[PDB]
Design a protein around this motif. Structure first.
Motif, short mmCIF file in Angstrom:
data_model
loop_
_atom_site.label_atom_id
_atom_site.label_comp_id
_atom_site.label_asym_id
_atom_site.label_seq_id
_atom_site.Cartn_x
_atom_site.Cartn_y
_atom_site.Cartn_z
N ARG A 16 0.84 -1.18 0.00
CA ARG A 16 0.00 0.00 0.00
C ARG A 16 0.88 1.25 0.00
NH1 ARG A 16 -2.94 -4.04 2.26
NH2 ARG A 16 -5.20 -3.86 2.02
N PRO A 17 0.43 2.35 -0.60
CA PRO A 17 1.32 3.49 -0.79
C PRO A 17 1.57 4.24 0.51
CG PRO A 17 -0.83 4.00 -1.67
CD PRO A 17 -0.92 2.61 -1.14
N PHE A 18 2.85 4.50 0.79
CA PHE A 18 3.27 5.30 1.94
C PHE A 18 3.50 6.72 1.42
CE2 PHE A 18 6.72 6.27 5.20
CZ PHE A 18 5.81 6.56 6.18
N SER A 19 2.44 7.51 1.46
CA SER A 19 2.43 8.80 0.79
C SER A 19 3.29 9.82 1.52
CB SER A 19 1.00 9.32 0.65
OG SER A 19 0.42 9.57 1.92
N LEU A 20 3.46 10.98 0.89
CA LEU A 20 4.21 12.07 1.49
C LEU A 20 3.50 12.60 2.74
CD1 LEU A 20 6.85 13.65 0.88
CD2 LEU A 20 5.48 15.22 -0.46
N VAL A 21 2.17 12.74 2.67
CA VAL A 21 1.40 13.18 3.82
C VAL A 21 1.48 12.15 4.94
CG1 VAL A 21 -0.93 13.69 4.64
CG2 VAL A 21 -0.12 14.68 2.52
N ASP A 22 1.51 10.87 4.59
CA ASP A 22 1.64 9.84 5.62
C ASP A 22 2.93 10.00 6.40
OD1 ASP A 22 -0.74 8.77 4.83
OD2 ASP A 22 0.04 6.76 4.43
N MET A 23 4.02 10.30 5.71
CA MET A 23 5.33 10.37 6.34
C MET A 23 5.64 11.74 6.91
SD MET A 23 7.80 10.10 3.00
CE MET A 23 9.31 10.43 3.90
N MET A 24 4.77 12.74 6.69
CA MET A 24 4.84 14.00 7.41
C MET A 24 3.79 14.15 8.50
SD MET A 24 5.41 16.09 3.97
CE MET A 24 4.58 17.54 4.54
N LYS A 25 2.80 13.27 8.55
CA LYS A 25 1.70 13.42 9.51
C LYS A 25 2.11 13.28 10.97
CE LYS A 25 -1.48 10.10 9.65
NZ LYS A 25 -2.42 9.27 8.85
N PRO A 26 2.91 12.28 11.38
CA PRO A 26 3.25 12.17 12.81
C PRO A 26 3.92 13.41 13.36
CG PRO A 26 3.90 10.20 11.63
CD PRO A 26 3.52 11.19 10.60
N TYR A 27 4.78 14.01 12.55
CA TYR A 27 5.42 15.26 12.92
C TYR A 27 4.41 16.39 13.06
CZ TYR A 27 9.43 12.65 11.30
OH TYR A 27 10.39 11.69 11.12
N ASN A 28 3.40 16.43 12.20
CA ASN A 28 2.39 17.47 12.31
C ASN A 28 1.59 17.31 13.59
OD1 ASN A 28 1.10 19.77 11.48
ND2 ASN A 28 -0.12 18.79 9.89
N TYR A 29 1.26 16.08 13.95
CA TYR A 29 0.55 15.84 15.21
C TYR A 29 1.39 16.22 16.41
CZ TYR A 29 -3.07 13.15 12.71
OH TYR A 29 -4.09 12.77 11.88
N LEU A 30 2.68 15.88 16.40
CA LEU A 30 3.56 16.30 17.49
C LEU A 30 3.66 17.82 17.55
CD1 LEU A 30 5.25 14.91 19.72
CD2 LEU A 30 7.19 15.13 18.21
N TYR A 31 3.72 18.47 16.39
CA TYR A 31 3.73 19.93 16.35
C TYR A 31 2.47 20.50 16.99
CZ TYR A 31 5.03 24.46 14.41
OH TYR A 31 5.43 25.76 14.25
N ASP A 32 1.32 19.91 16.68
CA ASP A 32 0.06 20.42 17.22
C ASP A 32 0.01 20.26 18.74
OD1 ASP A 32 -0.28 20.61 14.55
OD2 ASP A 32 -2.20 19.56 14.48
N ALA A 33 0.46 19.11 19.24
CA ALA A 33 0.47 18.90 20.69
C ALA A 33 1.42 19.87 21.39
CB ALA A 33 0.86 17.45 21.00
#
Lengths: 50, 51
Positions: B23-40
């Motif tokens: 299944r595709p590991f998209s660019l948003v997939d591989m930037m999302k955890p960092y975005n969630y940590l940024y939000d927290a």
């Protein structure tokens, strides 16, 4: 390697306060109300203890 | 196609940007955890600013 560890003594948490809720409000407000005139501090205040 | 009567498809054409039949590991997939940590962490920053 773990961070620094603080040795916290709870002898001044005010009366009728749980440690959990006391610490929770200390988190939220960054201010922890304490009670210098607790019965457990009587010796130090009156000069009977160190 | 000229030689194969069985070769046909529909109008739909596309691709999956995947790796080795997965299944595709998209660019948003591989930037999302960092975005969630940024939000927290920015949540902590805002609560500090309020206090």
């Amino acid at each position: 390697n773990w961070g620094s560890i603080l040795e916290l003594d709870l002898s001044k948490v005010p009366k009728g306060w749980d440690v959990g809720k006391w610490m929770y409000y200390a988190r939220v407000n960054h201010i922890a109300v304490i009670d210098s005139f607790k019965e457990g501090t009587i010796g130090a205040s009156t000069g009977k203890l160190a | 196609r000229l030689n194969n009567p069985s070769r046909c498809h529909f109008g739909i054409v596309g691709s999956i940007y995947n790796l080795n039949d997965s299944r595709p590991f998209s660019l948003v997939d591989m930037m999302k955890p960092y975005n969630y940590l940024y939000d927290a962490i920015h949540d902590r920053l805002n609560k500090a600013i309020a206090s």
